[model samples]
Target: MERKLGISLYPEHSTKEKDMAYISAAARHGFSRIFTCLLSVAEFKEIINHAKDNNMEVILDVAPAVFYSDLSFFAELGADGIRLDVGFDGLTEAKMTNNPYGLKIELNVSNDIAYLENILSHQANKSALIGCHNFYPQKFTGLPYDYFIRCSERFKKHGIRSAAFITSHVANIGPWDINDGLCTLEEHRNLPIEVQAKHLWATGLIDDVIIGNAYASEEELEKLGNLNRYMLQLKVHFVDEATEVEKRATLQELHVRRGDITEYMVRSTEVRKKYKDYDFPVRESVLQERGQVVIGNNSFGKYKGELQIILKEMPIDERKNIVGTIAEEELFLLDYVGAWTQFTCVE
Candidate 1:
């Protein structure tokens, strides 16, 4: 099955050249779409063109304050779709639009089955409808994870698709970045990209997805690109300078054994001894940082030879080699991982 990856572009958060660069990067990364809010962006059509050149579609995040009664306005802007805020009343007319771009109108993710049922009850076309939840602006205000699953399932029954927002966890960018991870649930903000994605995929809901932050580093974007190809591993993306020779052997080819569970972390089954020639004595010591991704060299108590990704930061004794941190944007993956699942990595 084909999965789509997306990046956000807020005109206010970046310059024209920056937006151009991100769209170009996203296109090169094989992303299929870009989402941007209309509030701060006065001239975003050039971006739409840039995205289209890359074979990617663009969607506008709109508020009712600037809501135009005419659908032609969006068609004029060349947007393929629009994501509207809570309590917006234009779906009925939007469904009736004649724009050949196939304008998709996405409802806020928290809208219930009853809400869409109400839409369907009135006979809206299911083909043009898309669903998405919000990213939290405040830390503790996101929806509960269980609730997110329920919403996805219900949306599925009607053939409505869900698009989720994953955060970069960096708050220094645009106004949108300062808000929620574009996550429906607050705890989700802490989950890795792959984890957030896998859970939603497991729910058999969520047809589309996008990275919600205004900007993400190339490494972070690469992880998203890999997920677009649909793979997540205990995979190392980049090993330290000296670990380069073994990087490919460790990341691209190894079978990932989801490690044993613990109060603060999960341990991978020991990497086989056939690779012992590559094993070395401990050198780097990580503080077992919350969401830290590491591998054991020696003296890790019972965790020897296993890769350990800790969910919370904890102090560790002196004898361990640190591999690398899961790209910060991908940390959300750690939350949903469990024993016996496959993992993706690089080094």
Candidate 2:
């Protein structure tokens, strides 16, 4: 499935003008989905119409009481779907899937229990059914890693499209008062927006990522727009003594770990052949530590220009020049870089 990016908007708490500008900016950055709480029918229609003009899918979040009242009213408001903030009994959620308007029924997937199982057992329309996790407004209140993975696995097993939220540091507004930042996973609360999205995509569980807070900066939107959604993309800071040749070999193209991999390092030996004729002159040797980027220097005869990411600590050697260091926060991504796995490095 094609992974997508989305942004949240609280029309109830924000003016229509502000919401319109956000939609336009988000649309320009390739955001195709909008998540907003439902309110003020007239105001909602205008915002929904603007979003529709931009070809963005809008999902209105409704409380259980509001959802229980009626369904057709949302169709009239021009939304692609409605998320049950708090769901009903199994049958009602299932029956709502068969609505004549063909609106999607989005259920909360944060619950780590049999909530989805019960709904599925009631013969819910799988095609029209989707799942999204809730965002926490307070710090240390979001879902834990283990619990998030467990809950997401349930939806993935059923082939239900799932979405999660990432926080924007600059965004101050959210669904409620306490605004530490609105994010689905507690671990992502402090990470860069793009890094958080990368983590979600790397899990191979989430299909879409939405910024949980309002007023995400334009820069934030662009960063998420340009994210490499399919593979591991590590950010690196090159050593001052690194040469242009080493930098190009590392950052100029895609890197795939050799199938016959070793325990000490992830070897992308293709670059050696690409730059075989080019001289890899010896530079200052720094101790190769875990997560350090290394390139074989001239001292290593045929291995010169071979790029490897250090997986364990090794004494400084003339043969291996420490080219750069991957971002500390992104070192966790190294675990996912397996044999024959494709990855890229960006400075």
Candidate 3:
């Protein structure tokens, strides 16, 4: 039941001194490993030097677009391992592209089961790791739990090690709407724990479960800590105070709102109809505004009236089009409001 935690360092936010400060904290906190996103070889070297100095193992999540350009640089940086965020295309391309001797490529498998299988069938033979992110549609609620079970089996069958950056509402938030509907922090914590447990029992495939966004509030962290207690084999990730701020800013830049519902607000009624278990009334209220209880973005400016009544009995495609238009309008209004309000109002 031994457990280890790691912290993520983002160079964009902190000076080298600040970065070292956090890395120092991570080392003091007894974090067994450290991770950082690498945009350049120098950055990678800086982190490696810091980690080595601090006596912590360093894991690098590198951009595949660049990795393909020069794998040798990463190999030379001598990261304990490398993480790839190439999406589906990146996964396929990396395998085809090949790698330098001794460098391991961690594939960021979002969704695309077919693509994942393709990786297993084709590239699992290479010295590689399968890295997953839980941001829905790409990871988390987007894919079925059983898919992961099957994926674990496939990876083991191919002798590949599996790992994931657990999705949190805070860091790596998926399209908000869908994630919020799935669960709150309490419920969300259960996913990785359960998935990891299953992987252990079923396939013995997952070697690490890196909990991303460990800089959550104390209360949230306590809850996660409890989950970790239950699932001892998983590895948790922590962020330095500075890196936490940068992570939050990066998420904010993506217009990832405070609460979940990005997907709920963006998805149309027609899209909801395809899933039998999908809740419409709740989603409509959450998206369109229930009286004054609007939890979603007011990007469309106009409020939903009796539009559902109008479209309720219409053809599926027609109703979908109407709802889609409403969602689009909301998105447009969001951008317009932002633009209009900049520089002491448009007055």
Candidate 4:
């Protein structure tokens, strides 16, 4: 099956004007969907309208807190679908109640399959999309490839559309030790394709790749473009290869510096900076540390293992908060400075 490329937007962290501009640009660039985070009714309306006007699909990611407050509000806002993170503690009842008959309910499930199966079983007849944001090693590392094969089989039996989150390597920043011990650039250039192939092989797993700030750099774009080419040559999908190139490049360049050295170098520098002090540890430790290091409403911890929340909307206050929070709670906060410094807000 052909994979869809989606872009995530954090409207809550952006000015309304900026959000509109960004959405408009994304639509022009052929983005399949615009997934916005934690939006108010007014903001949601604006985004939905803009997306509709431009003939783009709009997926509103409802914060569990907000969704619990009112699922109808999100539905009423006319979102094509709603994305919920695994960290959303109190969602069983609400999700069952607001399964949206036909609207897509994209659940971010990384860690607990039981929780995912429970939700799927309950909402069996409802329009559902299960997204695996496996930002941790237990979810994706050293396990038998058949683990994913089995997972895909299970999800298919339940009639769920599954997706894996694609973002920067965990060790690029955070409490996790780097595993590959390579430069961040190499990770950027390579990891997604590896992850993509693994996930694609799973029985019923479909690609719903979400590209975030980490993967939205120039160097990463080049790598992604190359990866897209390879995938097309391999006949991975029926879509035009040039279309993939345009889509990946457009998405990567959406927030890139005009003349930035490709996305690979940017990510490489970030990895080096984030883990300058520690040697690369096992993949599992690297994943855990990444959760410890990055900040934002959607950082590693926020999504647990299911959702890979990349920090795309970097604001000054948010940057300070992430750095400050890590410093206070983590033992080795200074080691992630390289990752932190990569943000335009910090620079």
Give the local distance difference test score of model 1.
0.64
Candidate 2 TM-score versus the reference: 0.94
- Per-residue CA lDDT of model 2 for 44-154, tens digit only, reads 899999999999988988654543435788899999998976777888988899888989999898988888788889877889999999999889999999999999999
Alpha carbon lDDT of residue 179, candidate 2? Answer: 92
Which numbered prediction scores highest in lDDT against the true structure? 2
Error of 4 at 81 (Å): 2.2
lDDT of 1 by residue, 147-190 (tens): 87787777777777677777775524545435645655576677
TM-score for all models, in order of appearance:
0.66, 0.94, 0.45, 0.46
Model 2 segments more than 4 A misplaced: 66-69
* Shift in Å, residue 202, candidate 3: 10
> Which candidate, 1 or 3, would have the higher lDDT against the true structure?
1
Error of 3 at 139 (Å): 12
lDDT of 3: 0.40
Q: What is the C-alpha lDDT of each candidate?
A: 0.64, 0.89, 0.40, 0.40
- Report the Cα lDDT for residue 119, model 4: 54
In candidate 4, what are the lDDT values of residues 1-347, reduced to their tens digit? Answer: 45555555656555667656655655444445655666347766876787778776666665445334345676677677766654444346336435544566666544435555555455444455545443332322432344545655555566666655445442232113333322111222234433343234222355555444322444443344333311211111111222222222222221222233322222212222222332221121112222122222222232221111122333232211122111222222122223322221110
lDDT of 3 by residue, 1-347 (tens): 23444555656544677667656654654555655665545765776788888776666775445434465665677676666555555355455336545556665544435555566565544555545444332223444555655655555565655554443344332222233322212323445423332233222345554545423233333343343322212121222221322222222221222222232232122212222232222222212331111211122213211112121122222112122222211122232112112100000
Candidate 1's TM-score reads 0.66
